[PDB]
Design a protein around this motif. Sequence first.
Motif, mmCIF file in Angstrom:
data_model
loop_
_atom_site.group_PDB
_atom_site.id
_atom_site.type_symbol
_atom_site.label_atom_id
_atom_site.label_comp_id
_atom_site.label_asym_id
_atom_site.label_seq_id
_atom_site.Cartn_x
_atom_site.Cartn_y
_atom_site.Cartn_z
ATOM 1 N N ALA A 186 0.981 -0.998 0.000
ATOM 2 C CA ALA A 186 0.000 0.000 0.000
ATOM 3 C C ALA A 186 1.182 1.201 0.000
ATOM 4 N N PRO A 187 2.218 0.828 -0.806
ATOM 5 C CA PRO A 187 2.763 1.852 -1.555
ATOM 6 C C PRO A 187 1.550 1.369 -2.383
ATOM 7 N N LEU A 188 1.238 2.533 -2.533
ATOM 8 C CA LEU A 188 0.126 2.515 -3.294
ATOM 9 C C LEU A 188 0.984 3.486 -3.948
ATOM 10 N N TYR A 200 10.046 7.700 -12.460
ATOM 11 C CA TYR A 200 9.015 6.799 -12.108
ATOM 12 C C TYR A 200 9.556 5.409 -11.765
ATOM 13 N N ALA A 201 10.382 4.913 -12.634
ATOM 14 C CA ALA A 201 10.947 3.573 -12.383
ATOM 15 C C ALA A 201 11.616 3.603 -11.012
ATOM 16 N N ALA A 202 12.352 4.652 -10.758
ATOM 17 C CA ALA A 202 13.037 4.773 -9.436
ATOM 18 C C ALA A 202 12.010 4.659 -8.299
ATOM 19 N N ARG A 238 12.003 1.520 -5.403
ATOM 20 C CA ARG A 238 12.039 1.724 -3.992
ATOM 21 C C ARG A 238 10.980 0.891 -3.395
ATOM 22 N N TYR A 239 9.908 0.932 -4.117
ATOM 23 C CA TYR A 239 8.776 0.190 -3.658
ATOM 24 C C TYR A 239 9.100 -1.276 -3.369
ATOM 25 N N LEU A 280 8.989 -3.782 -0.004
ATOM 26 C CA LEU A 280 8.197 -5.044 0.217
ATOM 27 C C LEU A 280 8.930 -6.377 0.363
ATOM 28 N N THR A 281 9.899 -6.509 -0.530
ATOM 29 C CA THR A 281 10.853 -7.643 -0.655
ATOM 30 C C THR A 281 11.507 -7.197 0.493
ATOM 31 N N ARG A 282 12.186 -8.147 0.907
ATOM 32 C CA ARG A 282 12.901 -7.806 2.048
ATOM 33 C C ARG A 282 12.722 -9.144 2.161
#
Length: 36
Positions: free
Chosen positions: A1-3, A20-22, A26-27, A31-33
């Motif tokens: 809900a990186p949205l 944008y890709a950047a 980050r997103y 989440l991954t982690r």
Amino acid sequence: APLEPEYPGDNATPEQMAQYAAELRRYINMLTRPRY
């Protein structure tokens, strides 16, 4: 809900996309982690 990122839609200008890709990069990072 990186949205989520946001994406214009295409190509805003010859870079946006880059930016944008950047933003999602980050997103994912977030989440991954991995763990592990």
